[PDB]
């Protein structure tokens, strides 16, 4: 009955393979069955009460590797199972779901810097290419608003961006939307009451506390409440009406800060530290483990 934050993988020195997931109401952290694969640079979702855990990047003292690997964890028996991979690895990727369908966006694989886009369908374990994006985006953000897929920010190899541009699935086609206020790769981007949210990033000069927010009946980007820390590289998602941001990057440190956004007083505020600092995880939200 009860949902949980959590988070998967992440990097402090190596990628790591932890899966934790916190209670904003009892405030613990769970410690569960660890990644097959340390990853950082990884995205969450959930389909159909499924953690799924998409690409990423094994950062490891023995050589560093991209991945294209899909992961699935059912909380329900507290294991892991693989799925088929994607068509490339992708590091630094972002994911959207619609329809019962994982859309595995952008990402890196070495000096590669994808605009390719692909579907995973749960129901055959089968990934398909779509259109690509009209701009290669590592780093990238991304959402889900009305069944349509939004690609915000991110880095084309050159140029940390603040585009974003939406996909249509029925046209299977990309169009350019307005672009953010603030330039920002690795910002965390989600969808909380309608609107997507663009929190952090990194605009090549500074990590970022900014946060900004896009309404699609006016086609414009509005500034919030800024965080209280800057990170890039951060954590996102949506907990019963609020937005959490866990770890990042700040110049300086792996953060373990988790911060928590009311959206109906325009507030952030600190309710818990991961138990270690780290950034390049995958966050979601779905059902407690079975007790067991
Ligand atoms: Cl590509
Ligand atoms: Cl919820
Ligand atoms: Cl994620
Ligand atoms: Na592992
Ligand atoms: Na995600
Ligand atoms: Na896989
Ligand atoms: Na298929
Ligand atoms: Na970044
Ligand atoms: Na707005």
């Not at 972002?94 to 952008?106: K, L, Q």
């Not at 000096?111 to 590592?138: G, K, Q």
């Not at 350019?176 to 206020?181: E, F, L, Q, R």
Request: net charge negative; proline share 4%; hydrophobic share 35%.
């Amino acid at each position: 009955v009860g949902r949980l934050i959590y988070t998967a993988g992440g990097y402090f020195r190596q990628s790591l393979s932890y899966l934790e997931a916190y209670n904003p109401s009892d405030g613990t952290w769970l410690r569960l069955a660890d990644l097959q694969v340390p990853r950082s640079g990884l995205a969450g979702c959930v389909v159909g009460g499924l953690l799924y855990a998409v690409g990423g990047r094994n950062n490891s003292p023995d050589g560093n590797t991209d991945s294209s690997a899909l992961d699935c964890y059912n909380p329900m028996t507290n294991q892991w199972s693989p799925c088929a991979p994607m068509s490339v690895p992708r590091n630094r990727i972002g994911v959207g779901v619609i329809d019962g369908h994982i859309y595995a966006v952008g990402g890196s694989h070495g000096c590669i810097h994808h605009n390719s886009v692909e579907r995973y369908e749960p129901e055959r374990d089968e990934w398909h290419l779509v259109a690509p994006m009209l701009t290669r985006r590592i780093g990238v953000g991304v959402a889900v608003l009305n069944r349509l897929l939004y690609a915000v920010g991110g880095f084309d190899g050159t140029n940390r961006l603040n585009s974003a541009e939406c996909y249509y699935p029925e046209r299977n086609e990309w169009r350019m939307i307005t672009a953010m206020n603030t330039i920002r790769s690795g910002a965390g981007v989600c969808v909380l009451h309608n609107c997507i949210y663009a929190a952090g990033g990194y605009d090549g000069q500074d990590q970022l506390n900014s946060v900004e927010r896009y309404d699609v009946a006016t086609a414009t980007w509005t500034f919030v409440a800024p965080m209280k820390h800057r990170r890039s590289a951060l954590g996102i998602t949506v907990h019963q009406g609020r937005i959490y941001v866990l770890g990042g990057y700040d110049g300086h440190t792996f953060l373990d800060s988790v911060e928590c956004y009311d959206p109906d007083t325009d507030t952030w505020s600190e309710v818990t530290r991961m138990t270690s600092g780290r950034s390049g995880v995958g966050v979601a939200v779905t059902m407690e483990p079975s007790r067991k």
